[PDB]
Write an enzyme that holds these catalytic residues in place. Structure first.
Site, PDB file in Angstrom:
ATOM      1  N   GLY A  32       0.590  -1.387   0.032  1.00  0.00           N
ATOM      2  CA  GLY A  32      -0.001   0.002  -0.040  1.00  0.00           C
ATOM      3  C   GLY A  32       0.678   1.319   0.131  1.00  0.00           C
ATOM      4  O   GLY A  32       2.047   1.281   0.014  1.00  0.00           O
ATOM      5  N   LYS A  33       0.118   2.247  -0.292  1.00  0.00           N
ATOM      6  CA  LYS A  33       0.602   3.717  -0.287  1.00  0.00           C
ATOM      7  C   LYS A  33      -0.064   4.654   0.649  1.00  0.00           C
ATOM      8  O   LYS A  33      -1.250   4.361   0.912  1.00  0.00           O
ATOM      9  CB  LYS A  33       0.660   4.283  -1.449  1.00  0.00           C
ATOM     10  CG  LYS A  33       1.278   3.443  -2.718  1.00  0.00           C
ATOM     11  CD  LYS A  33       1.609   4.303  -3.900  1.00  0.00           C
ATOM     12  CE  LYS A  33       2.375   3.426  -4.904  1.00  0.00           C
ATOM     13  NZ  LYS A  33       2.991   4.376  -6.050  1.00  0.00           N
ATOM     14  N   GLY A  34       0.603   5.672   0.961  1.00  0.00           N
ATOM     15  CA  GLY A  34      -0.069   6.731   1.875  1.00  0.00           C
ATOM     16  C   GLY A  34       0.693   8.113   1.305  1.00  0.00           C
ATOM     17  O   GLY A  34       1.725   8.006   0.556  1.00  0.00           O
ATOM     18  N   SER A  35       0.327   9.166   2.308  1.00  0.00           N
ATOM     19  CA  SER A  35       1.079  10.368   1.916  1.00  0.00           C
ATOM     20  C   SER A  35       2.717  10.164   2.418  1.00  0.00           C
ATOM     21  O   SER A  35       3.382  10.916   1.846  1.00  0.00           O
ATOM     22  CB  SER A  35       0.337  11.370   2.780  1.00  0.00           C
ATOM     23  OG  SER A  35       0.178  11.149   4.182  1.00  0.00           O
ATOM     24  N   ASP A 153      -4.350  10.579  13.919  1.00  0.00           N
ATOM     25  CA  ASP A 153      -4.803   9.846  12.782  1.00  0.00           C
ATOM     26  C   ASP A 153      -5.619   8.750  12.635  1.00  0.00           C
ATOM     27  O   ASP A 153      -5.341   7.663  11.873  1.00  0.00           O
ATOM     28  CB  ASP A 153      -3.623   9.870  11.656  1.00  0.00           C
ATOM     29  CG  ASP A 153      -4.280   9.960  10.174  1.00  0.00           C
ATOM     30  OD1 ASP A 153      -5.552  10.150   9.954  1.00  0.00           O
ATOM     31  OD2 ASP A 153      -3.538   9.885   9.301  1.00  0.00           O
TER      32      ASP A 153
END
Ligand code: 4E1
Length: 347
Positions: A32-35, A153
């Protein structure tokens, strides 16, 4: 030519399956990816185990924030060496090809995946209770004076199962976390889970994580976000639909009050004036949580009608707890210790 060919144009490492790093880690694939960057699945030759590796973006601001993450994880991990307080284990970190890499224990599906697998029908109230108790215990841990950590978060994607057939969880992504002293940001939290004090530009403390938790728990059982704003104005309005106008004593001290509200001559507050006979929101406080949960009508969408562990009494306790978590006032919003004593958790 970004970082000698190793990076794409958004500062991320170009992942290649099958790559071997430092004669140790065998990169399987992208999870996965995130900021912050990316997370990959890898086999650690040395320890003979699967791990998850967070690859931080190759850019100063991200590197510097991830250094804070590392400090906080190591601090949590040494007060919790028994791994009994529900926080993901950072095994080690290292620089590689100009990216800070964080190596974590492997975990299973996050709670959004879990919702998706039910086709957004929501999980049972029993399972919701189990997550809620764990999460409140985790927040109690963060609230210990030596830590005083604000996650900043919380959302379903950042709560993972340890094992796919079991209810044990861990919290991940302390990438925007901070401690009660050292608060450095203004616009934080994911929008659906963002607290009123943050929307209002006010100072914030550990209580914002409880707000988030309140939203999450409702979404886990209903299958959809409680407050699904498309921007800050929409978000605040959706909150007001359910909880009414925030108390004057808060709006009077709120730097961004007038982004959403207007103060009448008589000293009370209202929603900002809307145009032209346009109507978009339910009037303040008329979208009752009672109905959203289907307390007296077989749960969310009637879908729990005549199931066990879904009594009216069960739902009333659950509803009380959630409303205490969604107190507008952070001084009086329920805190982890007292939440753990709520009747919703009775053996
Ligand atoms: O903040 C993180 O550490 C994190 N962020 C993620 C962000 C997007 C998608 C997946 C993510 C993710 N999967 C993980 C697993 I499996 C184990 C431990 C940490 C993570 C993690």
């Amino acid at each position: 030519v970004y970082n000698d060919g190793y990076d794409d144009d958004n500062y991320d490492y170009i992942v290649k399956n099958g790559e071997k790093w430092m004669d140790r880690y065998e990169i399987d694939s992208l999870i996965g990816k995130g900021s912050f960057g990316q997370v990959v699945k890898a086999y650690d030759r040395v320890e003979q185990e699967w791990v998850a590796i967070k690859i931080i973006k190759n850019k100063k601001a991200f590197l510097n924030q991830a250094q804070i993450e590392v400090r906080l994880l190591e601090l949590m991990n040494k007060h919790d060496t028994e791994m009994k307080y529900y926080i993901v284990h950072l095994k080690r970190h290292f620089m590689f090809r100009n990216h800070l890499c964080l190596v974590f224990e492997m975990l299973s599906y996050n709670l959004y995946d879990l919702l998706r697998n039910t086709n957004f029908r929501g999980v049972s109230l029993n399972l919701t209770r189990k997550f809620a108790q764990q999460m409140c215990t985790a927040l109690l841990f963060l609230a210990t004076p030596e830590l005083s950590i604000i996650h900043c978060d919380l959302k379903p994607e950042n709560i993972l199962l340890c094992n796919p057939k079991r209810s044990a969880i861990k919290i991940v992504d302390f990438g925007s976390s901070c401690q009660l002293g050292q608060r450095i940001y203004q616009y934080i939290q994911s929008r659906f889970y963002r607290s009123p004090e943050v929307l209002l530009g006010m100072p914030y403390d550990l209580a914002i994580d409880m707000w988030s938790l309140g939203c999450i728990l409702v979404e886990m059982h209903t299958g959809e976000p409680l407050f699904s704003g498309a921007n800050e104005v929409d978000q605040m309005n959706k909150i007001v639909e359910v909880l009414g106008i925030p108390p004057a004593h808060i709006l009077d001290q709120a730097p961004k009050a007038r982004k959403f509200f207007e103060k009448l001559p008589d000293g009370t507050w209202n929603l900002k004036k809307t145009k032209d006979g346009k109507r978009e929101y339910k009037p303040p406080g008329t979208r009752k949580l009672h109905n959203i949960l289907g307390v007296e009508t077989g749960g969310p969408g009637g879908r729990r009608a005549g199931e066990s562990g879904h009594t009216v009494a069960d739902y009333l306790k659950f509803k009380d707890l959630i409303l205490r978590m969604l107190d507008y006032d952070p001084k009086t919003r329920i805190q982890p210790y007292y939440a753990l004593q709520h009747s919703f958790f009775k053996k």
